[PDB]
RNA sequence: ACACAAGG
RNA sequence: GCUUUACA
């Protein structure tokens, strides 16, 4: 069925002259047919053997062979007209009449208007499917925050307590819906920023040529990221949403956040392990970080990175010096006579002067991710020694600063990775600083504390293999029940804590860090 | 100058 | 051990 429609679609898109109405009507008919098919397939799930259940595979085929190829077709049409504008510019320039060059904003807009109609149709289609999946069946594994995000309300519908597997298929289908919405909006925003906006005026055109994108325009992707975040909320184990978030950051030249998300994609529990590493490496093999490093050290620059961005560039350059020496190692210097030790010193000062818990958390994820990916024992050991020097600087700061979330992460990283814990305890200094940090915290907790809900860091690192998919410093047994998920997404809106949430969280985090630190130090 | 990490 | 760079 899907193949037949795909073949008809390919015949339509290969026509030299696009009949937009034919394409839209064809899509609408295919959508209507797939909708009725999906609902019957879910309803008949009990009747036809559970391996015969195709809806997941048809959904992936619907996206890959039908909806996305139409997106790419429209994207190509935008590219053709954009290159026509380029051909005019080169012609006028060669002919000695560069001031006569005029953008032609007509016949860009008509093509984009047809694209926008298509996007609106499929946006409604996938939203309609998502509403069906999320409200037709009672699924206690769908967090309330997700329903609130869409303002779905489950009526007294069918209750498939009979089969957890059915509910798993339904939740996967909802994930795919959110993924398609994110992907469609991402492609739309990409087309708009790179083809449509540049073709609106000469006033639009030239800046794109001079500034490659200088894409501080992240707002245009906000909605796509939102949908991708919803995907991670539903099934954080799946690698694809993290990869697409990284793709967004990569497109806006935020190469560090791209790397972070590609590593998150690689380390998700059910990761395919293809996309994230390849994209991250494609960044690392390039010259962006080395060029940013030279611009930072030379001071005078339009580049003009913020302090946290400076730390990110320093971190990646220092890691590359060990992990990717062909690009980042020239004797004792990273590039252009810039010593490795100088940049390491500068970063370690910034940890004390510009300590940001989220910045440090991303630093830790990137750094220990690269450690995890390094096979060569010499490279891995050098990287680990660098990472633990960084951790030592953090612990020194934490002799006077706050940072309990970072400390929880560091301690669970050590707890869950026995080789790294062994290296940590083999370093005298690490032990001394950890002892001094913990001596500040009073705690009558001797056993792992219980808590009422997941804290921010717990939600953020769900199914991240770096900590073996969950924080284990808490006794969370009472939270891990099928018939509630609001506590696992950290939704405390139902908890009678008012303004006392922050002190409660701080106290509970302190208790957990005291217990786990003692356990680490005792060994 | 002595005590710390990088490099051959 | 020495030699070079960086920090303290």
UniProtKB/TrEMBL annotation:
Task: State any GO BP term from the record.
Answer: nuclear-transcribed mRNA catabolic process, nonsense-mediated decay
A GO MF annotation of the entry reads:
telomerase RNA binding
All copies of domain DNA/RNA-binding, residue ranges:
224-471
Pfam families documented for this protein: EST1 (PF10374), EST1_DNA_bind (PF10373)
Which Gene3D superfamilies does the entry link to?
Tetratricopeptide repeat domain
**Superkingdom field:** Eukaryota
Gene Ontology CC terms? telomerase holoenzyme complex
Where is the Telomerase activating protein Est1-like N-terminal domain positioned along the sequence?
58-191
Its name, as the record gives it, is: Uncharacterized protein
Which organism does this sequence originate in?
Candida tropicalis (strain ATCC MYA-3404 / T1) (Yeast)
């Amino acid at each position: 069925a899907i193949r037949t429609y795909s073949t008809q679609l390919e015949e339509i898109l290969s026509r030299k002259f696009s009949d937009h109405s034919l394409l839209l009507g064809f899509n609408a008919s295919v959508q209507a047919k797939i909708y009725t098919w999906i609902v019957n397939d879910l309803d008949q799930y009990s009747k036809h053997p559970e391996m015969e259940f195709d809806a997941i595979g048809v959904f992936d085929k619907l996206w890959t062979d039908f909806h996305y190829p139409i997106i790419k077709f429209f994207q190509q049409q935008h590219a053709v007209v954009f290159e026509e504008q380029n051909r005019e510019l080169k012609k006028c320039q060669k002919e000695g009449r560069p001031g006569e060059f005029k953008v032609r904003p007509v016949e860009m807009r008509k093509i984009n208007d047809n694209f926008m109609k298509y996007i609106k149709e499929i946006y409604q289609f996938y939203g309609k499917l998502l509403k069906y999946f999320t409200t037709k069946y009672k699924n206690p594994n769908i967090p309330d925050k997700f329903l609130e995000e869409f303002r779905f309300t489950v009526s007294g519908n069918a209750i498939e307590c009979q089969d957890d597997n059915f509910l798993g298929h339904v939740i996967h289908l909802s994930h795919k819906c959110c993924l398609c919405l994110g992907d469609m909006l991402r492609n739309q925003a990409f087309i708009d920023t790179n083809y449509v906006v540049p073709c609106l005026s000469n006033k639009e055109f030239f800046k794109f040529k001079s500034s490659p994108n200088k894409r501080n325009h992240m707002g245009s992707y906000v909605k796509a990221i939102q949908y991708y975040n919803l995907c991670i909320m539903l099934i954080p184990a799946l690698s694809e949403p993290y990869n697409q978030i990284g793709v967004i950051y990569n497109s806006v030249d935020d190469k560090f956040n791209a790397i972070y998300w590609f590593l998150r994609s690689h380390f998700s529990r059910l990761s395919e392990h293809q996309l994230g590493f390849a994209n991250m490496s494609a960044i690392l093999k390039k010259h962006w970080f080395t060029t940013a490093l030279v611009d930072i050290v030379n001071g005078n620059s339009e580049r003009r990175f913020s302090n946290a961005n400076v730390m990110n560039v320093f971190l990646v350059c220092l890691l590359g010096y060990i992990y990717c020496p062909e690009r980042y190692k020239n004797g004792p210097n990273i590039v252009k006579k810039i010593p490795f030790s100088k940049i390491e010193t500068d970063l370690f000062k910034m940890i004390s002067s510009d300590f940001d818990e989220q910045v440090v958390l991303k630093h830790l994820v990137v750094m220990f991710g690269i450690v995890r990916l390094t096979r060569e024992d010499e490279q891995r050991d050098k990287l680990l020694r660098f990472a633990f020097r960084y951790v030592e600087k953090v612990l020194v700061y934490l002799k006077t600063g706050d940072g309990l979330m970072v400390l929880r992460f560091i301690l669970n990283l050590l707890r869950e990775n026995a080789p790294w814990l062994q290296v940590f305890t083999s370093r005298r200094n690490c032990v001394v600083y950890l002892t001094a940090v913990l001596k500040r915290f009073a705690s009558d907790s001797t056993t792992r504390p219980t808590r009422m809900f997941f804290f921010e860091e717990d939600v953020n690192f769900r199914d991240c293999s770096l900590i073996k998919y969950q924080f284990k410093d808490f006794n969370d047994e009472a939270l891990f029940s099928p018939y509630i998920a609001n506590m696992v997404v950290g939704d405390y809106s139902k908890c009678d804590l008012q303004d006392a949430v922050d002190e409660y969280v701080e106290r509970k985090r302190t208790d957990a860090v005291v217990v786990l630190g003692k356990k680490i130090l005792s060994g």
